[PDB]
Structures are given as C-alpha cells and as structure tokens.
Design a protein around this ligand. Structure first.
Ligand code: FH2
Ligand code: MG
Length: 534
C-alpha cells in the first residue's frame, strides 16, 4: 500500500487521510465510510443518507500532467496540463456530451470516473446513483460524488473510490478496470462478433437497394453480423416506422437472416425528436425544465428530447420495442446517444439521472435477452458496465484521417484511434471495446493504404471489436488482406506501455494473440507503424 508525505497531505470527506472507519454528520447529510488497504492502494467505501448534493470525497494537490476522461463514448481520454487549462466554450447544442455537470467544465478541468498521473490512479468503481468526477480547483484535485439534489431517507451505498500507486501506470489502470468489472458484474463475451455496418459509407443516404447489394457481397467476407445503422427510420423515436425504399423493420430482419447473417440494428432509444410520433403522442414522457420538455441535444436539424426513464409507461414502451425487435430476429443492438437518458432535469420520480439511465438500459437488456449482443454508443461509460456487451470508446472514425480536425469529438480516424489506445484498459474488463469501424475501401475515401493498415492493425493488437463499414464493391485485394491480417492479431492481452504519452506515439504489446506475442508502435502524427509478430 502507498504510504508517504503525499498520502498524509490528502483529505477524505474533509478529514486528514488515514486508515480506519469514520462518521461525518453534517447539517443536511450523514456519511459512514471506511478507508481500507487493498493491493497497491486504498479503498474508500461506505454509505450516505440525507441530501449529500455535490459531495466532496477526496482532496489532494493536483499533478501537473493528468490523464483525464470524459464520461461518454465520444469524449476524449487524453493527457492534459492541469495548470494551463482554460475552460472550453460549450456548444449549447451538445452541452451534455461535454459534461453532465457543465457548471464545472465551464470553470475547471473535469475528469469523469477516473484520473491518472504517472504512477497513480484515482478511480471510482461504480456509477449507480451518483455521478463520480474530479475537478482541478485552484491547484487542488477534488473528487466528488454528484447526487443532483436527490434526498435519501435511508442509507444508500457510496460509489467506492480507489487510490492506487505503482510505477507501472498501465498495470494500475488495468487493475482499476478489473476492480470496476468485479464491482459491476461486467459482461465480457467469450466470442467477439465480426460484421458489417452501413454508416461510414452510406451515412443517412443508405437505401435498401444498396443494402441488398452489400448483403449479397457480404457472403464473400468473414462477417457474422449485418447491421443497419441510422437511415431506415422515419424519425428519432419512431423506430418501427421506416422511410424511403426500406421495407418493414421485421421484413428487413427476415431478409438479413434469410441471407445467413445475424441481423443488427441501430437505435437511439432514449431520444425522441420534436417531430416524432411518439413525442407528439406522449409529451409527458420526456425530461422537463420548468415543467416543459428539456432539449437533451440538437441533431438531424431537430430538437431532441430525452425519455424520462423513471416513468413506468416509458419503460414499458422500451421493453415492448426491444422485445418486438428480438421477436423479429435482431440479435445485435447498437444503442446510441445514450447520454440523453442521463441528462440532468425534472423527472416523474425524484431519482438521479444516473438511477434513471440504469433503469432504462436494464429494461433494454431484459427485453433483448441474454443471447442478444448490446453495443453501447454515445454512452456514459461506468453506469453501463454489467449491461452492455460492447461499448464504443471513442469519437466517430471517418473515411479520412482528419488533418484539419481538432480533438473536439468531430469525426476523424486519428482521434477515434487515439481513444481506442487511451481507453485500452477497459477492454475485456468492462466489456468488449469497440474502436469504431474499419474503412477498407480503395475508392470514395481519402485514407491511404498505410493509414488503413495503421488503424486496422492497432485495433487487432488491442483485441477490440472488428466491424467493417464500406460499400463492399469498392473493397479489393488490399482491403481484404488487411481485414484478414487484422483478425489474425486478435485474442491477446494488450498493454499500452506508455499511456501518459503526449506526442501521439504509442508502444502497444499484446500477449497470446492468434499470431503469438505481438507489438505495434504507432505514430498518429506521421501516420506510421512498426509491427512485430513472434
Ligand atoms: O446518427 C448515426 C450515428 C451517430 C453517432 O455519431 C454514432 F457514433 C455513429 O457511429 C452513427 O451510428
Ligand atoms: Mg479478448
């Protein structure tokens, strides 16, 4: 266990750090907590009742360089200089992707769930009730549990906090993630699906006619799943109403299955647009502000509202939707924009947005059953552990590297891959990491052969999910060889050896792959790699 001058300098719930069992009785809340030794660190656990509000758990001097983590799929996991931080301007159309507590992020450096420095990890093991986050406030790192003004008549469990120390920072992050996995009964599938996804070629312009073209060609590729992305639906929330040349959602599943694939489908199940049938029928089903529908985000050139997952009517609707899809034969569900279900606001029941979120995703899991694969996307990470099988862990990739794209969550292969690297340790611990789709076509793309190889082989070494997204008629010998060689790199235990890198060069080893022990060194600025196989 770490002992030292820096440990004496910490405070836990406002008290000087030391081992033991404690009670803090304040005006508005009571905390009972223990500070206990664990392998390579300390664990702070306990229970809280009353109105804890934004509850300070830990305080310590901020490190100079910190690995910070955004709460959801698309947001950055990256090393930042804690002392030269300036607040970002928050996009009013996407504020809750930046932070569930935007008041923090507009003033102070924020990290959600965990934060790391060289030789040290601070990390919460769960987000079941509170949102756990860190802020750097006038040179101090402060760990908080946000309860969003909810009051608890009887004790509920704290989200446990671990403080881990060891010179091997990657080992610490892996250990943290194993503790999260155990705390939340993580689903780690024994088999990883391969497959095809429409989005990164066709986007919203997918037709059924092009879908069928790809379905036929897909029989020549090593694809298990055939997944229809955003395009088929008439509106956001109207998931069983199709548009354009698409047949019924049931019919699509039957054609896909008849052609020998596992049918997959995209939804944004916690989202309903201002124009949707479901919203116009059920205006009382959404999260509110001053009693009116609260915009969760703007996309598809529409205001999008969040379903209120505290309401039984809403949970019954979700259950019926996903049960219906399962009955049709879908067994792979990409469930997206899930942050919407955890937006702060007024709900029917006085529960946190995190409690609400977890009721929603648990309902989905019950509806699709145990033999359905759930891929989360645009999702709060820690609250989803135990429910999803796979999780998108980066911003969207793209059929271009993204030379002129900032690290701001806009699609770009370079930033998608950076997050697959810096969140590598969640893989096979929280869930299967989804690094986003391989784009292996050699027309209708600005990616080079070398860029396609660098992305693909990195994902292989990391043992991540391998989904291709292309017009398959434009994938020829190079693309077919890259996919084949990628799948030969799967099956190992990866480690990013230099996780605190600030120059976008990473050394990645993977032990026990289908190709033996491998190593790839990548440079995301020069777009070069060096791959070794044993
Ligand atoms: O709207 C479709 C869509 C939205 C998000 O950006 C996802 F991350 C992306 O993969 C696509 O599914
Ligand atoms: Mg594995």
């Amino acid at each position: 266990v770490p002992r030292g001058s820096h440990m004496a300098s910490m405070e836990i719930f406002g008290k000087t750090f030391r081992e033991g069992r404690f009670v803090l009785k304040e005006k508005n809340f009571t905390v009972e907590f223990a500070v206990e030794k664990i392998h390579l660190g300390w664990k702070i656990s306990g229970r809280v009742k009353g109105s804890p509000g934004r509850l300070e758990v830990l305080r310590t001097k901020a490190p100079e360089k910190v690995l910070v983590n955004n709460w959801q799929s698309w947001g950055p996991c990256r090393v930042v200089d804690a002392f030269s931080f300036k607040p970002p301007e928050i996009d009013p159309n996407w504020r809750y992707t930046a932070s569930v507590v935007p008041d923090v992020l507009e003033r102070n450096l924020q990290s959600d769930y965990f934060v790391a420095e060289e030789g040290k990890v601070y990390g919460f093991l769960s987000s079941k009730i509170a949102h756990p986050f860190f802020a750097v406030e006038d040179g101090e790192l402060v760990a908080y549990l946000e309860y969003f003004d909810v009051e608890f008549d009887d004790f509920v469990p704290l989200e446990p906090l671990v403080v881990l120390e060891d010179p091997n920072t990657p080992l610490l992050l892996e250990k943290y993630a194993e503790l999260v996995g155990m705390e939340n009964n993580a689903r780690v599938p024994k088999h990883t699906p391969t497959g095809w996804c429409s989005w990164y070629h066709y986007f919203l312009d997918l037709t059924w006619e092009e879908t069928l073209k790809n379905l036929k060609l897909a029989k020549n590729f090593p694809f298990e799943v055939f997944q229809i992305d955003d395009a088929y639906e008439k509106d956001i929330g109207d998931w069983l109403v199709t548009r354009g040349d698409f047949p019924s959602v049931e019919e699509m599943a039957k054609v896909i299955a008849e052609n020998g694939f596992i049918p997959g489908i995209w939804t944004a199940p916690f989202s309903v647009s201002e124009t949707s049938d479901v919203f116009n029928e059920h205006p009382d089903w959404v999260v509110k502000e001053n009693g009116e529908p609260k915009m969760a985000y703007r996309n598809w050139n529409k205001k999008i509202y969040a379903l209120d997952l505290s309401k039984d009517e809403v949970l019954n609707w979700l259950f019926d939707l996903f049960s219906s899809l399962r009955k049709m034969g879908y067994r792979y569900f990409k469930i997206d924009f899930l942050f919407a279900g955890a937006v702060p606001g007024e709900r029917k029941k006085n529960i946190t947005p995190i409690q609400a979120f977890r009721k929603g995703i648990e309902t989905i899991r019950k509806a699709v059953g145990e033999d359905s694969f759930i891929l989360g996307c645009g999702s709060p990470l820690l609250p989803a552990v135990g429910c999803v099988d796979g999780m998108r862990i980066g911003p969207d990739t793209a059929p271009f590297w993204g030379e002129h794209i900032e690290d701001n969550g806009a699609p770009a292969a370079r930033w998608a891959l950076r997050n697959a690297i810096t969140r590598y340790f969640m893989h096979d611990r929280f869930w299967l990491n989804d690094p986003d789709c391989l784009i292996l076509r050699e027309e209708k793309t600005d990616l080079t052969q070398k860029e396609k190889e660098l992305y693909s082989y990195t994902c292989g070494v990391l043992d991540n999910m391998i989904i291709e997204s292309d017009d398959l008629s434009l994938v020829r010998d190079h693309g077919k060889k890259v996919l084949k060689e990628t799948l030969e790199l799967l099956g190992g235990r990866p480690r990013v050896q230099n996780i605190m890198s600030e120059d976008l060069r990473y050394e990645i080893v993977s032990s026990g792959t289908l190709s033996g022990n491998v190593k790839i060194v990548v440079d995301l600025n020069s777009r070069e790699y060096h791959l070794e196989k044993e």
